[PDB]
Design a protein around this motif. Sequence first.
Motif, PDB file in Angstrom:
ATOM      1  N   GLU A   7       7.928 -18.565   0.642  1.00  0.00           N
ATOM      2  CA  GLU A   7       7.210 -17.720  -0.353  1.00  0.00           C
ATOM      3  C   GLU A   7       5.847 -18.343  -0.661  1.00  0.00           C
ATOM      4  N   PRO A   8       4.914 -17.531  -1.181  1.00  0.00           N
ATOM      5  CA  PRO A   8       3.564 -17.997  -1.524  1.00  0.00           C
ATOM      6  C   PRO A   8       3.600 -19.218  -2.446  1.00  0.00           C
ATOM      7  N   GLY A   9       2.883 -20.254  -2.102  1.00  0.00           N
ATOM      8  CA  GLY A   9       2.877 -21.473  -2.960  1.00  0.00           C
ATOM      9  C   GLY A   9       3.985 -22.426  -2.507  1.00  0.00           C
ATOM     10  N   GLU A  10       4.744 -22.046  -1.515  1.00  0.00           N
ATOM     11  CA  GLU A  10       5.839 -22.934  -1.033  1.00  0.00           C
ATOM     12  C   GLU A  10       5.282 -23.914   0.002  1.00  0.00           C
ATOM     13  N   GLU A  27       0.035 -19.910   1.616  1.00  0.00           N
ATOM     14  CA  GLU A  27      -0.649 -19.026   0.631  1.00  0.00           C
ATOM     15  C   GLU A  27      -0.266 -17.570   0.901  1.00  0.00           C
ATOM     16  N   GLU A  28      -0.121 -17.208   2.146  1.00  0.00           N
ATOM     17  CA  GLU A  28       0.252 -15.803   2.475  1.00  0.00           C
ATOM     18  C   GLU A  28       1.361 -15.803   3.530  1.00  0.00           C
ATOM     19  N   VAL A  29       2.211 -14.813   3.512  1.00  0.00           N
ATOM     20  CA  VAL A  29       3.313 -14.760   4.513  1.00  0.00           C
ATOM     21  C   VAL A  29       3.299 -13.401   5.216  1.00  0.00           C
ATOM     22  N   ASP A  30       3.731 -13.354   6.446  1.00  0.00           N
ATOM     23  CA  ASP A  30       3.743 -12.061   7.185  1.00  0.00           C
ATOM     24  C   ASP A  30       5.065 -11.917   7.942  1.00  0.00           C
ATOM     25  N   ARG A  35       4.658 -14.486  11.011  1.00  0.00           N
ATOM     26  CA  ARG A  35       3.669 -15.600  10.974  1.00  0.00           C
ATOM     27  C   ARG A  35       3.480 -16.066   9.529  1.00  0.00           C
ATOM     28  N   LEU A  36       3.362 -17.348   9.320  1.00  0.00           N
ATOM     29  CA  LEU A  36       3.177 -17.863   7.935  1.00  0.00           C
ATOM     30  C   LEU A  36       1.744 -18.367   7.763  1.00  0.00           C
ATOM     31  N   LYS A  37       1.106 -18.012   6.681  1.00  0.00           N
ATOM     32  CA  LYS A  37      -0.293 -18.471   6.456  1.00  0.00           C
ATOM     33  C   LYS A  37      -0.278 -19.772   5.650  1.00  0.00           C
ATOM     34  N   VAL A  38      -0.292 -20.894   6.316  1.00  0.00           N
ATOM     35  CA  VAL A  38      -0.276 -22.193   5.586  1.00  0.00           C
ATOM     36  C   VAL A  38      -1.480 -23.036   6.015  1.00  0.00           C
ATOM     37  N   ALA A  46      -8.467 -28.346   3.156  1.00  0.00           N
ATOM     38  CA  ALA A  46      -7.321 -27.495   3.585  1.00  0.00           C
ATOM     39  C   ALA A  46      -7.683 -26.769   4.882  1.00  0.00           C
ATOM     40  N   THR A  47      -6.742 -26.626   5.775  1.00  0.00           N
ATOM     41  CA  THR A  47      -7.033 -25.926   7.058  1.00  0.00           C
ATOM     42  C   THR A  47      -6.051 -24.767   7.241  1.00  0.00           C
ATOM     43  N   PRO A  48      -6.268 -23.667   6.506  1.00  0.00           N
ATOM     44  CA  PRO A  48      -5.406 -22.481   6.581  1.00  0.00           C
ATOM     45  C   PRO A  48      -5.139 -22.063   8.031  1.00  0.00           C
ATOM     46  N   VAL A  49      -3.953 -22.303   8.518  1.00  0.00           N
ATOM     47  CA  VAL A  49      -3.632 -21.919   9.922  1.00  0.00           C
ATOM     48  C   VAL A  49      -2.337 -21.106   9.944  1.00  0.00           C
TER      49      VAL A  49
END
Length: 59
Positions: A7-10, A27-30, A35-38, A46-49
């Motif tokens: 979940e977001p923030g996890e 931060e975002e999940v799909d 695909r997970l936005k971490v 931070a490197t959102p990948v």
Amino acid sequence: RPKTLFEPGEMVRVNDGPFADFNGVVEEVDYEKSRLKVSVSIFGRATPVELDFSQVEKA
């Protein structure tokens, strides 16, 4: 037996690709795109990948 409930923030764990051995938060999940936005704190930034559920482990 990694959990697929994210979940977001996890926080998650990366063990594949150059981001392996690194942790971060989703931060975002799909679920539709599977695909997970971490982002990974690399270089102090931070490197959102996007990582797959099996590509990362639940923290």
